[PDB]
Amino acid sequence: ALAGTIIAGASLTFQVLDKVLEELGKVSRKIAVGIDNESGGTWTALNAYFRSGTTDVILPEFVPNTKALLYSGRKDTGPVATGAVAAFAYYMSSGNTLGVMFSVPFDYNWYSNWWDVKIYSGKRRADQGMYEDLYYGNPYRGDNGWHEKNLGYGLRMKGIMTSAGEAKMQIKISR
Ligand SMILES: C[N+](C)(C)CCOP(=O)(O)O
Numbered sequence: 502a503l504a505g506t507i508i509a510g511a512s513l514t515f516q517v518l519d520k521v522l523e524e525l526g527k528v529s530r531k532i533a534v535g536i537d538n539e540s541g542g543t544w545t546a547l548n549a550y551f552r553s554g555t556t557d558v559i560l561p562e563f564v565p566n567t568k569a570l571l572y573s574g575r576k577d578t579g580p581v582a583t584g585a586v587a588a589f590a591y592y593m594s595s596g597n598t599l600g601v602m603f604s605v606p607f608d609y610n611w612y613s614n615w616w617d618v619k620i621y622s623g624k625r626r627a628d629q630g631m632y633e634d635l636y637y638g639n640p641y642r643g644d645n646g647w648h649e650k651n652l653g654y655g656l657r658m659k660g661i662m663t664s665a666g667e668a669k670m671q672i673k674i675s676r
Contacts, residue, residue: 504573505558510537510673513569518669521573530554530576530584532605532668537569540656541676542594544570550627552604553577554585564591574603582607588632590625597654598625602635605643605668614643616662616670620652643668 503521513535521533538544546560554576561570574585586604598621606612617640641648643662652658660672
C-alpha cells in the first residue's frame, strides 16, 4: 500500500494523500497523514495512541532526511458513533521526540477537526497524556488552511489538515 511506507519528501502531495484515503475504503471518518522530514537527520518510529478509532498500518519505522512518511487512520467499523483521534511520535537523531496529534470527531455538528505538532525533550511515547497535551493546548483546526510555526530546537514546521470526515494532513519539519 501507500500507508506504512516512506517516499521522497519532494513527492508528497494531496494526490498521494487522497489515494491513501481511498485504500481505507468507504468509511465515514478517516484521515491520511503525510510528514516530510528535512530535519537534517533520520527519524525512528516510537508509537501511536488512538483516542478514537484505529489504523490498519504500521508507523514507518525509519524516515531518513529528505524522505516523507505516509500514515492513515479511521473510526471503528459499524454502527458506532465515533471518530478518528490520536497522537503518535518519532525519535530524532538530535535526541528529542517529535509529537503529532489529529482529531476527527464523529459529529461535525458541535465539534470540528483539530491537530498539532510539538517537540518533546528527550524520548517520550504517545499517550493519553501527550494527546491531551496537544488537544487541549492550542492545536490548529483542520481549516483546510496552512499553518507554520517555530518548533524550537531550530526546526520550524509547516502544515495543514482538511475539515471533513475524510481528512488529509500534510506536515513538514525543516532545519
Ligand atoms: C470530541 N471529542 C470527544 C473527541 C474530544 C473532546 O471534546 P471535549 O469533551 O473536551 O469538548
